Amino acid sequence: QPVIPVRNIYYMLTYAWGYANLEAIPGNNLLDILGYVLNKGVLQLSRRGLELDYNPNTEIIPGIKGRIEFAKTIRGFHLNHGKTVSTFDMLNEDTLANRIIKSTLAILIKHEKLNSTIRDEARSLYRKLPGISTLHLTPQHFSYLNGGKNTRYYKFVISVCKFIVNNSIPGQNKGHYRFYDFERNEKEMSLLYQKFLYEFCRRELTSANTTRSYLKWDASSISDQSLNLLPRMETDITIRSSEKILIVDAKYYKSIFSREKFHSQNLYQLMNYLWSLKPENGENIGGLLIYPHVDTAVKHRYKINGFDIGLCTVNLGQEWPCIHQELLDIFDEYLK
Amino acid sequence: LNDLFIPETTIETILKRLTIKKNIILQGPPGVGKTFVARRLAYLLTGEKAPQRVNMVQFHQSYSYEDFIQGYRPNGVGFRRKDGIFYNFCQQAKEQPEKKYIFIIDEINRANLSKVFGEVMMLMEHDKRGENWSVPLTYSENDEERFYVPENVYIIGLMNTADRSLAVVDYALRRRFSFIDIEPGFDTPQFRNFLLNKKAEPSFVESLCQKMNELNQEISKEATILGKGFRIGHSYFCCGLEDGTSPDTQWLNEIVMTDIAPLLEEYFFDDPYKQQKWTNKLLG
Amino acid sequence: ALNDLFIPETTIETILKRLTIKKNIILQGPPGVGKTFVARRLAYLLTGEKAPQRVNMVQFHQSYSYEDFIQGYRPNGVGFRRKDGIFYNFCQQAKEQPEKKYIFIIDEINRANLSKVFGEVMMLMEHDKRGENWSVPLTYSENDEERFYVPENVYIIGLMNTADRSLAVVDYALRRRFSFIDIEPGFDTPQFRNFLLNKKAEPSFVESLCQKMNELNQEISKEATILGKGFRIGHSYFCCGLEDGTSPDTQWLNEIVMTDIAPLLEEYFFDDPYKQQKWTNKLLG
Amino acid sequence: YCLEDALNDLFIPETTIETILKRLTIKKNIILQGPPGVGKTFVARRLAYLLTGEKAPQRVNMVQFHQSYSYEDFIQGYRPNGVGFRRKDGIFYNFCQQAKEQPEKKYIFIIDEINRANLSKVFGEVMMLMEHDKRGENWSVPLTYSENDEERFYVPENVYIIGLMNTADRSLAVVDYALRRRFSFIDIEPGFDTPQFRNFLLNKKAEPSFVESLCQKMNELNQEISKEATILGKGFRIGHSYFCCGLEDGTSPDTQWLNEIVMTDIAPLLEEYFFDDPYKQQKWTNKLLG
Amino acid sequence: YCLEDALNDLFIPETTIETILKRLTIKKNIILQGPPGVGKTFVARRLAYLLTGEKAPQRVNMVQFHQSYSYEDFIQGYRPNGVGFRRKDGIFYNFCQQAKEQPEKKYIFIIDEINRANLSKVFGEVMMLMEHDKRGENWSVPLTYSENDEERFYVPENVYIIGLMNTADRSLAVVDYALRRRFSFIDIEPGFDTPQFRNFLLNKKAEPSFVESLCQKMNELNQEISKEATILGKGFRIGHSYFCCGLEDGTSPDTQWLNEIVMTDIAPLLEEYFFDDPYKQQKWTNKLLG
Amino acid sequence: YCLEDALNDLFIPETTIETILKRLTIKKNIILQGPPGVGKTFVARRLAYLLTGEKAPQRVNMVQFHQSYSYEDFIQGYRPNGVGFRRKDGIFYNFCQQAKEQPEKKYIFIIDEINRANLSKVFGEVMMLMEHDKRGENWSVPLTYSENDEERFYVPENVYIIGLMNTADRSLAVVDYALRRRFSFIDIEPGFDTPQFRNFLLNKKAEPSFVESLCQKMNELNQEISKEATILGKGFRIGHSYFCCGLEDGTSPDTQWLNEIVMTDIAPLLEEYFFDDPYKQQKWTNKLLG
Ligand SMILES: Nc1nc2c(ncn2[C@@H]2O[C@H](COP(=O)(O)OP(=O)(O)NP(=O)(O)O)[C@@H](O)[C@H]2O)c(=O)[nH]1
Ligand SMILES: Nc1nc2c(ncn2[C@@H]2O[C@H](COP(=O)(O)OP(=O)(O)NP(=O)(O)O)[C@@H](O)[C@H]2O)c(=O)[nH]1
Ligand SMILES: Nc1nc2c(ncn2[C@@H]2O[C@H](COP(=O)(O)OP(=O)(O)NP(=O)(O)O)[C@@H](O)[C@H]2O)c(=O)[nH]1
Ligand SMILES: Nc1nc2c(ncn2[C@@H]2O[C@H](COP(=O)(O)OP(=O)(O)O)[C@@H](O)[C@H]2O)c(=O)[nH]1
Ligand SMILES: Nc1nc2c(ncn2[C@@H]2O[C@H](COP(=O)(O)OP(=O)(O)O)[C@@H](O)[C@H]2O)c(=O)[nH]1
Ligand SMILES: [Mg+2]
Ligand SMILES: [Mg+2]
Ligand SMILES: [Mg+2]
């Protein structure tokens, strides 16, 4: 039952979200890492200052503040008891972005499995936010915040809060929570891996141009030109350079972690991408399948159907920089 | 200068800082006599025990610029521009420049200080006091009429350090205010001499300081969660003994469950064992 | 009055020791504990003369504001007049009688914003700052001739309840100025048992009920987070319906469980009807 | 008024002031951004008299914004005279009427702590008008509370706007980028490493050795702050104002004097900048003492 | 007045201008969205004279929305008279009555910074009536504060509406998709690559290599902005207005002048734009300086 | 008022309009729930004339709701004179009184953009009477502002109420409780894949294959929107009204005409929709152009 060391996963999430010392913390499990980032992360923000968004307020007060609304004033006859309906801009930290933080911290405290030091510190912070109102979080709240008015730093922790909320399950008690065993399921870990590379490649491979490319079948059918029933095909990544193009399909499988038969079902998708893809420059066409392995990394090359394809692995759990070196080393060979 | 439980040095620091800087913040936990210090201290700088010169207010989250300085509020006929207390108070000191008029602000941390003060957030500085630095106010009908802090005004700020708010940090306001911490002062003789002049046992006073200080050190142990700002004040012991009931362990035991126990609960929240532990340590 | 109260006598002594010195107090307990009836008997107890005129009661709500409480401008036949509120008129009534203790009851205090209502007065009601020296001009006190000061004689008791889990930590404003007391349901007390033996209740029926409510009250309070000690059921439901003329009996209890305890049990748990059905049936027998 | 009258006590370099006056004559709107304690409020009144060339406060209006400031107060709005409400010409509107009377003479409006108030709501109509190329009757606009379209308000050409915005708070920043274009942003530095700052100290019978030690100390400390731009940018760095005032009596600035001010002001300030590291607090504080 | 006069100085391609009139004349309500400094305010006054065919201000009305305009202000509201309130017809209602006074000659209403205000609150009834199909007496509607006696208000066919929504403030974006269908949105580009911008500098005593390098660097920079979408989207990219102005006296464009622009205005803009690493700021500032 | 003139031009199936007429006669409180550009406003004017069987404006009244709309204007309220307050009968109060005169003849009241205003603030007391069962003198009520209890207001049975609500905003995800009970929602499809819309296009000199390619992409694109619920629900999908407009000249549909609409309406619309994935915009926009 082998899985990745948890500290390494957090780095992959970082590139996935597109944006520190984790050596100090002694809790290997994910939520200990994740809460410490958030719990420490909030402390970084307050030092600079949290976002205060002017919320206009239309209220009934005993006097003039800002602009009086003449209509609501006369119709409700508020003038008689010395009041007006006036519009003004109270400055609060009660924004949706900031409200989300406090609600998430409550979940963090309620979590059954958590370091005591981590939980104690957060409870202080929860007290330190008196004005802000707790909320019952939904993705629909997160949906509204895709506008991204907030700063770049806020977006980091908000993505963290998204991870916690979706990966929160009730455990022994009605109130308390228990963290999801994220590593075990391949799909979400795989979907992380696919996103991990795409944003990673833009950062380091400045020489090359990296975009996900939609592909269209060469087919024609008498029945329907649409061919809607046919499978939708969108690359995981394409990393194009002037001398050579390359398409990658990367996925996380449990069977491959055991060092026998090999699970390479994704390859069947790959050739069809090569076929539908036609290069105007005609420099070259290359393919790569890359998977995560724990113990060691092995690289192979193949010449299958007139295409030059590489199968390779990476030893996750090794070390993050050496992994970062290994990834650049890997792509450099094939990008040639 | 007799019944104060604070060292003479701290008040000696304060008076030079206050006279020089003209604005200060006395920050410490509740129960150290912040109000009594300023009220006592205010009469010293005046040189006479005059309460009319001194005015005290207690800020709170809903307090606003409408109340403090200026504001539009209803008279019997209708709405008018109503001169707030500080505008009225500065006018009062403007009447008499020579004497020193004082303004005390309690629970300052709660309200959004920038919001309330507004215009005077610049003017309050000691250098920028006078007609030269006057500015027209927000609600001033005419630009020509302006507001300026007089030189005689001195402001003292009393802040509860037990509710830190990670909402707004202003380092500019901190420039106007010279911040002064205040310790509870259990060890100080002046607190001890008072009790020994109330028919207390010599050992009982000595026993108390050891017991309480161990808690304060534990409270100041974890700098991130808590600090010296959180630690327990002394004033709870001052009150309730001027009837004639001399100190005794039962008197302490009354205070412990009555006063300290909620504080402990608040501080050592969701850890009953620590409360029972530290509470019981005191009784012995 | 003392014997009729069901709570431990020791707590009753404790409260007046607090109130007389502290002068501000708040009672937090489950609904149906007679919190209003408690304060009234306690209020008359402190005065010693059982005068209702001295006592005045108000129940707070979120709309409740400074104009209702203290002072405000109300329409006349034409135009408007300044209209003195409860506390402003109330204190001046006590001002004539300095020696005489006067009481004010604030029910459901936690719902409203204490700051918004009180305003200026929130500092003057703190016991240290009382009397003529601590005078402040009021918001609507247009002239400076008159100032409002709360005199020393005033005592303020607040009725708050721990019923709702939605309620977060109490407002900080309260904690400073108020001393928190938790009131037990008081089933175990002999005074409640002597209130049922006085109605010829069976000691087994009485003894069972004391254990029975405790058995639920122990279980409901076992939960750390959602349902605390504050949730557990109070005794007030049992009073009303016995001395009207109807004797205690198992069927009399049976009606009451359906009346109040059965829906109340649903509200607190609100998750498992089987858990409710187990306990509701258990209460009957 | 004259230039050298200002420069005598001013710690800012002359290059900056000439840079300031060059932009302001052109752009007609400027923003001075820096940490607290570098004389933003101090220069602003001085610079006005230079730009006009005459020490006229009548032609200068100086105001401090805050949260409870609105278009109704600033420009125009309906306010109660008494029983009957009236339209009240705000302060900026009144200033513009005066400047029209004397088109030749420059009239200057100085806004302290501009970043606080909601500038979009406050200026509003002015946000377009204030630009250097859009001033005059040609771009005249009718206001919200104008009785009819015929009543229109245009900024005079002579008007110059100066804004002071501290960089200590990232919460309150001029993020409205459209507004950013109107204002020409002029950074201002603490200015420890200047002769004029040093000569003022020596003028107050100060040790040259202690002075050179002081400037080197603060410059290094400020450099540490600017490094961690993620946590604290250069905008947070300490100003010179703590050291400036307090010597008016004639007290010499000895090392003991420095030891007191650090204890009362800078020490807790460092606690806020460095909440997590207590060692870092003692390190820089003791460096000054040692 | 004619297109040659209007398009004499404009740096926008002809492509948009006819495309604008193609969309405008059929649809009659449009929005011009681009970052600040691309002449949105600049062209809009010029376009109005084209459609009428004459330089007349009377048929045109210009306003700006400041997040405090309201239906009481725009269309119908109540104002204090001396002792008591009165009903006042807003400006738009006042304008439309003039517009239907003569249908033949076209009337334009210009709304700058339209994005700010909550438009559903402002327009109210008009949001339906503004559209081209639903115009004329057929779709006459009674207003909220209209008299009980039936009197109805309809948008005349001749009216054309122009909106000017900057693309910098993301939050202040139209999410009232019902309203976004009434308008047709015309993107305006920064205008660096175009020769008509370049020719303007060369006419004003500029070197072509220095000019072509300048446009070369900016377009590279703007693509880096276009590369990102999280915070800094495509719309944030810098306009050409900064370089336009300040050369009227005869000051020739040179690296000294460019250095003034970059240090003074843009370099602040970049650090606010990035606010992650100064090196990205130092890089691009040095690139422009290089 | 013949159906043939009414229903031929319309794109909506004859299936849905009949069902609309069924529930409308039955329940008399109806809501047409669909995105903008599907003819919600267009049908409502026709349906009223269908039910009456005649083209009469007096018997039919149209309004658009907005935040300023209130009880005081809709039903009854007090409007100030120069000093005094005079009561004023509101629209619906005035409107029903006309319907009382002719109880046999059907009367129609149309409320566009109903969600923008809270119904409780406007209707209030009348939401009890507005319901289909509780109508007639039996259920009569006296008004809040009535001088005496004698005067009473009851919704006559003849009036039918139509409310046009757009499923284009995130706020409407939490539909108002008042609407659900008292109104009967009807969903209006976008209606690209419809015979009459196609027949309309062919009638205006359009190639048949070009029409079918267009509908499949929009029908495919709308499916992509409907799959999500978090950001874009099914109600967000494009309506059929962008393409209707602009052909009154007789200009034939083509990629040239299509390109104007995509770039000026649907392309930035997608930018607002798919902010997170700019490539999704290019993926779809280019797909349509091809
Ligand atoms: N004597 C003298 N004082 C200076 C000089 N520069 C700044 N100061 C002083 O520093 C103090 C504050 O000036 P000010 O402009 O208000 O600083 P600030 O950055 O605007 N402060 P804030 O941002 O908090 O409002 C005054 O004592 C001012 O005279 C200087 O060159 N000479
Ligand atoms: N001479 C000349 N100036 C131009 C041209 N294009 C833009 N400008 C100038 O750039 C400056 C601002 O133009 P403007 O219309 O206000 O841009 P804006 O989008 O309206 N500004 P904002 O978005 O901030 O409201 C003016 O100096 C304007 O004349 C042009 O083609 N020729
Ligand atoms: N000829 C014709 N035009 C139609 C048809 N359906 C809609 N339209 C046209 O689409 C345009 C707008 O229709 P409309 O009802 O206003 O859509 P809406 O739902 O009211 N828009 P909104 O939701 O934004 O208020 C009008 O030109 C209308 O006639 C149709 O079936 N045939
Ligand atoms: N003698 C003496 N009395 C004190 C001292 N400190 C506080 N008191 C008294 O304690 C009571 C309450 O003080 P208070 O201002 O409310 O506490 P604080 O505001 O939290 O500091 C008053 O009677 C004070 O005078 C002290 O140091 N010495
Ligand atoms: N006689 C007597 N009645 C009590 C006692 N305690 C409560 N009650 C009765 O219980 C009722 C008040 O209960 P209460 O909880 O305040 O009602 P609630 O405010 O709605 O929750 C009255 O009938 C009280 O007289 C008591 O100790 N003795
Ligand atoms: Mg200043
Ligand atoms: Mg503009
Ligand atoms: Mg419509």
mmCIF file of C-alpha atoms in Angstrom, chain F residues 47-140:
data_model
loop_
_atom_site.group_PDB
_atom_site.id
_atom_site.type_symbol
_atom_site.label_atom_id
_atom_site.label_comp_id
_atom_site.label_asym_id
_atom_site.label_seq_id
_atom_site.Cartn_x
_atom_site.Cartn_y
_atom_site.Cartn_z
ATOM 1 C CA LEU F 47 -50.409 36.841 -25.725
ATOM 2 C CA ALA F 48 -52.461 39.596 -24.128
ATOM 3 C CA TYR F 49 -54.011 40.490 -27.470
ATOM 4 C CA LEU F 50 -54.627 36.787 -28.123
ATOM 5 C CA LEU F 51 -56.589 36.294 -24.923
ATOM 6 C CA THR F 52 -58.613 39.457 -25.393
ATOM 7 C CA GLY F 53 -58.909 38.536 -29.058
ATOM 8 C CA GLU F 54 -58.436 42.214 -29.909
ATOM 9 C CA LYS F 55 -55.745 44.872 -30.197
ATOM 10 C CA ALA F 56 -56.597 47.241 -27.327
ATOM 11 C CA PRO F 57 -53.987 49.188 -25.315
ATOM 12 C CA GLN F 58 -56.300 50.331 -22.504
ATOM 13 C CA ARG F 59 -57.086 46.806 -21.315
ATOM 14 C CA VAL F 60 -53.373 45.873 -21.252
ATOM 15 C CA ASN F 61 -50.646 47.456 -19.139
ATOM 16 C CA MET F 62 -46.901 46.877 -19.183
ATOM 17 C CA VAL F 63 -44.275 47.644 -16.544
ATOM 18 C CA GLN F 64 -40.678 46.814 -15.685
ATOM 19 C CA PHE F 65 -39.681 46.276 -12.073
ATOM 20 C CA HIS F 66 -36.554 47.667 -10.463
ATOM 21 C CA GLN F 67 -35.247 48.282 -6.972
ATOM 22 C CA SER F 68 -36.875 51.704 -6.670
ATOM 23 C CA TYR F 69 -40.353 50.296 -7.397
ATOM 24 C CA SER F 70 -42.451 50.201 -4.251
ATOM 25 C CA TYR F 71 -45.911 49.729 -2.797
ATOM 26 C CA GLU F 72 -46.371 53.482 -2.645
ATOM 27 C CA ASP F 73 -46.281 53.801 -6.445
ATOM 28 C CA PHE F 74 -47.706 50.464 -7.516
ATOM 29 C CA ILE F 75 -50.844 50.357 -5.368
ATOM 30 C CA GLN F 76 -51.361 53.429 -3.186
ATOM 31 C CA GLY F 77 -49.219 56.026 -1.492
ATOM 32 C CA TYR F 78 -48.778 59.658 -0.553
ATOM 33 C CA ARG F 79 -46.998 62.146 -2.790
ATOM 34 C CA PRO F 80 -46.005 65.536 -1.327
ATOM 35 C CA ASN F 81 -47.453 68.728 -2.706
ATOM 36 C CA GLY F 82 -45.530 71.977 -2.207
ATOM 37 C CA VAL F 83 -46.097 71.461 1.523
ATOM 38 C CA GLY F 84 -49.018 69.115 1.987
ATOM 39 C CA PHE F 85 -49.294 65.385 1.400
ATOM 40 C CA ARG F 86 -51.916 64.201 -1.086
ATOM 41 C CA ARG F 87 -52.824 60.544 -1.415
ATOM 42 C CA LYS F 88 -52.373 59.014 -4.851
ATOM 43 C CA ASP F 89 -53.949 55.920 -6.314
ATOM 44 C CA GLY F 90 -51.268 53.717 -7.811
ATOM 45 C CA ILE F 91 -51.147 51.967 -11.152
ATOM 46 C CA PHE F 92 -52.439 48.529 -10.204
ATOM 47 C CA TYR F 93 -55.121 50.126 -8.051
ATOM 48 C CA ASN F 94 -56.072 52.371 -10.963
ATOM 49 C CA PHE F 95 -55.697 49.506 -13.427
ATOM 50 C CA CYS F 96 -57.946 46.982 -11.681
ATOM 51 C CA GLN F 97 -60.706 49.573 -11.244
ATOM 52 C CA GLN F 98 -60.886 49.699 -15.031
ATOM 53 C CA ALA F 99 -61.115 45.906 -15.116
ATOM 54 C CA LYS F 100 -63.927 46.028 -12.551
ATOM 55 C CA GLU F 101 -66.040 48.022 -15.001
ATOM 56 C CA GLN F 102 -65.740 45.274 -17.637
ATOM 57 C CA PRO F 103 -65.556 42.049 -15.613
ATOM 58 C CA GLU F 104 -66.265 39.874 -18.634
ATOM 59 C CA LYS F 105 -63.406 41.267 -20.723
ATOM 60 C CA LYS F 106 -59.946 39.961 -19.915
ATOM 61 C CA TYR F 107 -57.304 42.398 -18.633
ATOM 62 C CA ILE F 108 -53.547 41.800 -18.604
ATOM 63 C CA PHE F 109 -50.754 43.216 -16.425
ATOM 64 C CA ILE F 110 -47.151 42.571 -17.532
ATOM 65 C CA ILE F 111 -44.171 42.805 -15.154
ATOM 66 C CA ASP F 112 -40.751 42.657 -16.796
ATOM 67 C CA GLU F 113 -37.561 41.902 -14.849
ATOM 68 C CA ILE F 114 -39.534 40.997 -11.761
ATOM 69 C CA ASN F 115 -36.673 39.505 -9.749
ATOM 70 C CA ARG F 116 -34.853 42.833 -9.519
ATOM 71 C CA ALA F 117 -37.392 44.160 -7.017
ATOM 72 C CA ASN F 118 -38.514 42.322 -3.923
ATOM 73 C CA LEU F 119 -42.162 41.517 -4.509
ATOM 74 C CA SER F 120 -43.038 41.854 -0.829
ATOM 75 C CA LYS F 121 -41.969 45.487 -0.772
ATOM 76 C CA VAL F 122 -44.242 46.299 -3.700
ATOM 77 C CA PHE F 123 -47.256 44.030 -3.450
ATOM 78 C CA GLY F 124 -47.247 43.424 0.269
ATOM 79 C CA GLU F 125 -50.802 43.021 1.481
ATOM 80 C CA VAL F 126 -52.004 42.228 -2.042
ATOM 81 C CA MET F 127 -49.983 39.016 -2.379
ATOM 82 C CA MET F 128 -52.802 37.406 -0.415
ATOM 83 C CA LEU F 129 -55.409 38.705 -2.863
ATOM 84 C CA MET F 130 -53.246 38.204 -5.953
ATOM 85 C CA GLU F 131 -53.501 34.423 -5.577
ATOM 86 C CA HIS F 132 -55.866 32.699 -7.977
ATOM 87 C CA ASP F 133 -58.319 31.200 -5.477
ATOM 88 C CA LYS F 134 -58.583 34.194 -3.120
ATOM 89 C CA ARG F 135 -60.128 36.697 -5.519
ATOM 90 C CA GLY F 136 -63.437 38.514 -5.592
ATOM 91 C CA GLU F 137 -65.411 40.603 -3.124
ATOM 92 C CA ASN F 138 -65.548 37.694 -0.671
ATOM 93 C CA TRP F 139 -61.847 38.104 0.159
ATOM 94 C CA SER F 140 -61.755 41.935 0.099
#
